[model samples]
Target: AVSESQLKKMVSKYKYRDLTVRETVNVITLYKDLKPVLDSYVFNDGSSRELMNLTGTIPVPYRGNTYNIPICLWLLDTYPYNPPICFVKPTSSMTIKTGKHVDANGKIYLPYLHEWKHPQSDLLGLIQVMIVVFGDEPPVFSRP
Candidate 1:
């Protein structure tokens, strides 16, 4: 659970000037709900209106070795009513492949993304779904 002070701190730190009163509340609510989980991995870039970049690698073991997948999310202005834009960002040493969960440019496509709904959908859920999806068909990696 997120305290009011914590929420306010986030708002101020992020400089969410573009957000309306209602939108601010909505973002606060989402942040409050997902703070526990999101705080563990996502980094507060504090640049865009509503964007968070994954700070660490999500390990996926394929065969005998593990692959790291880096992801990021961008919440639109009409957030809580629409799904966010997400992508897998490969590092300089990594090359993402097309015709899979992540496209060449890292745009993610999955069942949860296709079925996302407003008010019910949340960033935490999206991360969880992404983890599930990657469990089977993890993002591919190659030398860039």
Candidate 2:
């Protein structure tokens, strides 16, 4: 619930120019619960730049209950041509489970991203995959 930016404001960022306009924004309009944003992003190599991403809760069903899992999705400037980075943003009361799909930083490592070479994938398509994989295995849980 930080600052939410409009799709127009996000596309205005020069860094996001390479993103596929038609397919990308088309998917963006689908997820009303997730907020599209443009913010400062730093690479692991220490390089930093402005980037567009989606942040909010993805309702994941697990254990017969639906949990609103906080998530942060980082979209590469290349967009449909590339797989985006994904992470689970656990709240204060919860901590990461770090099981098969999630790593130490709560970053997701799923076969879906590896299989994104189809060249026909969209943002929501990737997220829809997250819901299923994450459903079978919760990424974060209440701290004990």
Candidate 3:
């Protein structure tokens, strides 16, 4: 975690841009709030700045087994205004779901995403909702 002074300095760099003072502050607040949530999942850095990857094995008591479900979020430049793209990365041992909320590639399409509003929508909240969604129906095993 960055020190408070460091975070302020980091955010200060963007404060002089065309963004409003509120937007500038939010940029700092978002990072501060998001870093901890991502850390909670032990999230790994993605291939590039656009993608933030989170991979882990979560125990699924209903199935009496554990499963590795990786997820990656595509953070947009127009972030607060637009929701990040979320995809469920399935491993060889797991089967991806094709529910109404999930696409063929395991991308997620939740109601909250469609109803997202700036400042009110947050990555942590979205991730928490996602945890519940997966908990209700954990990925099934598919290894032969």
Please tell me which predicted candidate would have the highest TM-score against the true structure: 2
Per-residue alpha-carbon lDDT of candidate 3 for residues 1-144, written as tens digits (9 for 90 to 100): 556565444434332323332432453354333231121222356432222223333333445655444565544334453445666666665677554566777777777777778567765666666556666766443544
Between candidates 1 and 3, name the one with more favorable TM-score: 1
Q: Lowest-lDDT window of 10 residues in candidate 3?
A: 33-42
Clashes of each: 0, 0, 0
lDDT of 1 by residue, 1-144 (tens): 446565444444343323432453554454432221123223366433434323334666666677666665554334453445667766776666543557777776766567767556655566666666675676655745
The C-alpha RMSD of each candidate to the native structure, in angstroms, is 7.9, 3.9, 8.2
Name the lDDT value of residue 53 in candidate 3: 25
Specify the highest-lDDT model's number. 2
lDDT of 1 at 124: 58
- How high is the CA lDDT of each candidate model? 0.53, 0.68, 0.50
lDDT of 2: 0.68
lDDT of 1 at 79: 45
TM-score, cand. 2: 0.73
Per-residue lDDT tens digits for candidate 2, residues 100-139, read 7678887767666656666666567777877777778776
Worst lDDT run of 10 residues, candidate 2, spans 1-10
